[PDB]
């Protein structure tokens, strides 16, 4: 096939100038569409604070509407998910990636709507679930729809806008721009097939919704952290231990949430009037926390700069990890539209932190800060849960910019995706589209 | 296919135990190349630095002694890679892309020695050219020599263990273990085709590699140049116009190392005695330039933050620049063994510096600096040119340290990739690969 | 240059205290750990103790409680060291070093003049 | 903890000659750095990491050994270098400094 390749080589990269406008404006729609879902997000957080002060007198009072309106917000976006678009539940990246298979369909005439006003009941109730679900699968939609509007033709289109879609869907909700091109390219494409992806479009998808994110969000970042020290080369070895652990860890996750599936099936059985009554349970239980255990509660993204600087108590650290591991999984196992991204950093975080702790106290001719130990896990539930490490890894960096770590942050994610392989493993993502495309 | 995919999942991203602990040794083995090999080539230019000092008198004596021992060095390389080794000419990287494709022979009994001492006698003479088509050769080279030596079966065994010898060789040449992975995923890679290669093996590979080069050169960067300013969101259009010229300079230069590696071919006919003599010539003009204009000589590292500083003139930006346009073609048209990746920063650098000092002349409202479109144009040839943006930018980020500048960066970088495409541009390293071919 | 220049030793009658003063120059003080080491006449060099940047971290030699108290003012670029209960033992010259690493087993990098502390009746 | 206790307490010997002294450790010890006092200047980190020189160091200095011993040495020694060294660990905790070596000029 020698003088095949020679005329592919010579025509290599050259994207149709209609695929690159396209890119351009769905980004710039997912954009804008994950701006006004997170300025969304929280009002609807900040409207439940505002109630308790006008009952701060009768505290039982006060536990009472913490509860309600997480239950109210919760179950109105179960409703809107099984009543108008099933698939718009838990996540929604598997559907995504699905649909680069031609295996799922993009609906989104009804997904947009149910996703997104889902989701701000769901998150904006105080539900332990990432804006970054959501902000994917609602992105690719967005792409499909201006496909469906513009009808362009091609596999190359169709797997292209659908790809920039949820890549400028993923930017948006960390303003991570690398890391989400990356997450198409790691993950999201579809893996045991070759692909007409314009790679080159992805990027003027991201860059548009990237600014559109900017130009209303900036002189403020996600994460704060400042500028930790270094890891001498002597260290190393202990961050590949670290690794090693959420390696054992990770697999031992993922088997709840789909075990913890079942278990909140069987609940509901799938009667939607049970399935919504059970959500108004677990939002309000997580609005309730939210007022009473903030650690245990929200999206996660709060306590990640609490965590590193030493802030927390050990005990706390084992506490919030046992009790967000818990609601974690109330809270996407049932369904409730809304990613676990998010939430998997802070799970992430506060091993790493607890474990720079114990890494100080047994190590100090090393000169430990407990902030590396940290960074380096942050990403590291998402290499031993989704095992996407290159994205984790490039996603942290965009969020805490602390190169000098990079060795550690890196060496610590292949002890991950190494040893959580090496127990039997799933990637999570995928382990979902298969339990889908089996029960259809 | 439904059944096919859903156990194509169950069993993914599985790779087999002894790839791994075979993708360990490749990348320990480069990294070791690697080091050895830039200390190799800085030890002879001293000498040559040494024997300046020792003739420090004879002004006319010392044009030549420069021309010489540099035009020695020159030619020991031409001829090493004309006697035993045709394929480790010029940057090497078009030859593993072959071998990925299974179009090319990997004769690393024949290279690694060839490219190893070839090398040290174009980058030791002071030649503008890169170490970095030289490493990651010897590392491809040094990964078929372990499938060998080891036995192993397949064409996973083959693709994967060839491509961590090609990345853990590129970060090691810049200490760019991100960019390294990224090299493989955007550009190496068979780019038609679907392949075995294990991105968690590449992973692996990298990491040694460069754990190598931290332990023979730590506390050290090959770039400081500080934290830059911000770039305010009324600011990001100058980087696409700062682009849109790298666009259109991009195919230009693509043209000219095409164009001029035929012209000196005619010089020599292919026979190996004129070949060597014209080389020690351009090589005695390198070590001769390196003498009076070190900026228009070199591989260029040491100009690139004495230019973003501003520490240049306009006038010595615009001579450093044709100067370097001209003696980067002379180095690489000419099949020297060496790379032309760290000699292109060199130019986007100093381009882009230019660019600044215009824009911050016109624009006192925006209080800019022109450091920052240095940093921006630095990766911006290697976008328009051999068209790797993304590898380009996260290479740039990883020895800068300058994420503020992660979105004027992204937007270069595509201005160049998009406007190279709307002239009439190609893959230098696929349109290499491609006239390589084309004779073949 | 980079100048360690510690100042505030001198006389002090047993049981006392004194407080010496490190300052800085020639560096950012901040992102440095800074150690104090001490060393009597005719005698070999002692460790007191050393804190890092946040102040969130002082270690001491094993001798005693309130003894040494090393508090750095990282605005001030200024090292402080409090010895309290001042014994003839305690009669030496007190050096400050900042404090860097390689392979990552740490030494004492760039170290100051010294100061002189007498301690008799 | 590790006592270190350099061996040739005090010495002499001639310029243009060769040097050299000792470190020991009660237990096993990774990377000795070496100090270099002149009565009435700062201490002078002078070899660290096992064997590795500063900036400024001639290099006739060097440094060898392993484990529990370890080991300076001037390959034809010069005026300037008649001082005391101090070698010190810290793959341990705490650190610890040996008792010294007296260089001194023989005529």
């Known amino acids: 096939r020698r003088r095949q390749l020679i005329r592919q080589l010579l025509e290599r990269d050259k994207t149709p100038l209609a695929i690159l406008f396209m890119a351009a404006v769905v980004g710039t729609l997912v954009g804008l569409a994950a701006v006004a879902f997170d300025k969304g997000v929280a009002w609807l957080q900040n409207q439940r604070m505002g109630a308790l002060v006008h009952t701060a007198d009768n505290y039982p009072l006060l536990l009472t509407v913490a509860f309600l309106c997480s239950a109210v917000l919760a179950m109105f976006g179960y409703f809107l998910v099984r009543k108008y678009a099933p698939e718009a539940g838990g996540s929604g990246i598997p559907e995504i990636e699905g649909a680069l298979e031609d295996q799922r369909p993009v609906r989104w005439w009804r997904v947009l709507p149910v996703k997104f006003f889902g989701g701000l009941g769901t998150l904006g109730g105080g539900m332990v679930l990432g804006a970054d679900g959501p902000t994917v699968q609602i992105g690719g939609n967005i792409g499909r729809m201006v496909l469906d509007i513009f009808r362009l033709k091609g596999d190359e289109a169709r797997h292209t806008l659908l790809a920039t879609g949820a890549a400028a869907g993923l930017a948006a909700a960390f303003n991570a721009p690398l890391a989400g091109i990356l997450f198409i390219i790691e993950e999201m494409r579809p893996q045991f097939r070759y692909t007409l992806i314009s790679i080159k479009a992805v990027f003027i998808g991201v860059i548009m919704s990237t600014i559109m994110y900017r130009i209303f969000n900036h002189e403020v970042a996600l994460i704060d952290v400042g500028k930790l020290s270094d890891a001498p080369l002597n260290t190393l070895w202990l961050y590949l231990i670290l690794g090693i652990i959420f390696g054992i860890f990770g697999p031992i996750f993922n088997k709840w949430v789909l075990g913890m599936q079942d278990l909140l099936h069987r609940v509901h059985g799938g009667n939607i009037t049970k399935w919504v009554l059970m959500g108004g349970a677990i939002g309000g239980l997580c609005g309730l926390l939210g007022f009473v255990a903030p650690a245990t509660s929200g999206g996660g993204a709060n306590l990640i700069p609490i965590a590193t600087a030493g802030n927390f108590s050990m005990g706390m650290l084992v506490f919030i990890f046992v009790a967000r591991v818990i609601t974690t999984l109330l809270c996407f196992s049932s369904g409730a539209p809304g990613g676990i991204f998010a939430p998997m950093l802070a799970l992430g975080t506060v091993l790493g932190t607890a474990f720079g702790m114990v890494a100080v106290e047994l190590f100090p001719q090393y000169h430990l800060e407990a902030g590396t130990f940290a960074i380096a896990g942050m990403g590291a539930l998402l290499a031993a849960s989704i095992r996407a490490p290159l994205t984790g890894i490039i996603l942290v960096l965009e969020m805490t910019d602390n190169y000098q770590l990079i060795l550690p942050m890196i060496i610590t994610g292949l002890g991950a995706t190494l040893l959580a392989q090496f127990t039997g493993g799933k990637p999570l993502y995928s382990a979902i589209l298969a339990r889908t495309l089996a029960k259809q | 296919r439904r059944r096919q995919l859903i156990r194509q999942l169950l069993e993914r991203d599985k790779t087999p135990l002894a790839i791994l602990f075979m993708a360990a040794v490749v990348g320990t083995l480069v990294g070791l190349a690697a080091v050895a090999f830039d200390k190799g080539v800085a030890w002879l230019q001293n000498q040559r630095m040494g024997a300046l000092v020792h003739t420090a008198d004879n002004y006319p004596l010392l044009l030549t002694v420069a021309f010489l021992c540099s035009a020695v060095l020159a030619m020991f390389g031409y001829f090493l890679v004309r006697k035993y080794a045709p394929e480790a000419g010029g940057s090497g990287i078009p030859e593993i892309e072959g071998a990925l494709e299974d179009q090319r022979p990997v004769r690393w009994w024949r290279v690694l020695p060839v490219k190893f001492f070839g090398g040290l006698g174009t980058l030791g003479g002071g030649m503008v050219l890169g170490a970095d088509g030289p490493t990651v050769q010897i590392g491809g080279n040094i990964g078929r020599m372990v499938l060998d030596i080891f036995r192993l079966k397949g064409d996973e065994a083959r693709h994967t263990l060839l491509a961590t010898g090609a990345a853990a060789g590129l970060a090691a040449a810049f200490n760019a273990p991100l960019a390294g992975i990224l090299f493989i995923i955007e550009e190496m890679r068979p780019q038609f085709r679907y392949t075995l290669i294990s991105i968690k093996a590449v992973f692996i590979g990298v990491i040694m590699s460069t754990i190598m080069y931290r332990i023979f050169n730590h506390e050290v960067a090959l770039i400081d140049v500080g934290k830059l300013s911000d770039a305010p969101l009324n600011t990001l259009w100058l980087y696409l116009i700062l682009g849109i010229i790298f666009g259109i300079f991009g195919p230009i230069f693509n043209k000219w190392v095409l164009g001029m590696q035929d012209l000196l071919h005619r010089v020599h006919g292919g026979n190996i005695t004129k070949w060597v003599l014209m080389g020690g010539a351009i090589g005695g003009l390198c070590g001769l330039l390196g003498f009076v204009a070190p900026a228009t000589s070199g591989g260029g590292a040491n100009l690139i933050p004495i230019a973003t500083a501003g520490n240049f003139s306009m006038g010595m930006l615009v001579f450093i620049f044709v100067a370097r346009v001209i003696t980067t073609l002379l180095c690489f048209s000419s099949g020297a063994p060496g790379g032309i990746f760290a000699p292109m920063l060199a130019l986007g650098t100093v381009l882009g510096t230019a660019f600044g000092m215009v824009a911050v002349e016109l624009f006192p409202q925006y209080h800019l600096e022109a450091g920052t479109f240095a940093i921006a144009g630095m990766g911006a040839l290697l976008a328009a040119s051999i068209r790797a943006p993304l590898t380009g930018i996260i290479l740039v980020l990883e020895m800068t340290d300058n994420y503020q500048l992660i979105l004027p960066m992204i937007i270069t970088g595509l201005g160049a990739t998009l406007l190279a495409q709307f002239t009439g541009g190609k893959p230098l390293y696929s349109a290499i690969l491609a006239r390589t071919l084309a004779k073949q | 240059e980079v100048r360690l220049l510690e100042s505030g030793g001198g006389l002090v009658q047993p049981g006392g205290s004194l407080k010496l003063s490190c300052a800085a120059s020639g560096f950012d003080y901040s992102r440095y750990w800074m150690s104090w080491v001490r060393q009597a006449p005719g005698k070999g060099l002692k460790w007191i103790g050393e804190i890092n940047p946040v102040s969130s971290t002082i270690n001491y030699t094993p001798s005693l409680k309130d003894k040494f108290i090393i508090s750095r003012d990282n605005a001030k670029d200024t090292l402080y060291l409090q010895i309290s209960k001042v014994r003839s033992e305690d009669t030496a010259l007190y050096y400050c070093?900042?404090?860097?690493?390689?392979?990552?087993?740490?030494?004492?990098?760039?170290w100051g003049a010294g100061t002189t502390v007498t301690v008799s009746s | 903890d590790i006592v270190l206790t350099q061996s040739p307490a005090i010495m002499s010997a001639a310029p243009g000659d060769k040097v050299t002294m000792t470190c020991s450790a009660s237990?096993?010890?990774?990377?000795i750095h070496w100090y270099q006092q002149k009565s009435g200047t700062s201490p002078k980190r002078w070899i660290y990491?096992?064997?590795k020189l500063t900036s400024g160091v001639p290099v006739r200095f060097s440094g060898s050994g392993s484990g529990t011993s370890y080991s300076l040495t001037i390959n034809t020694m010069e005026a300037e270098d008649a001082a005391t060294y101090y070698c010190?660990?810290?793959?341990?905790?705490?650190?610890?400094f040996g008792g010294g070596t007296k260089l001194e000029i023989l005529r």
């Open positions: 070093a900042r404090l860097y690493y390689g392979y990552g087993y740490w030494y004492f990098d760039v």
């Open positions: 010190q660990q810290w793959s341990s905790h705490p650190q610890t």
């Open positions: 990491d096992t064997s």
């Open positions: 237990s096993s010890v990774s990377y």
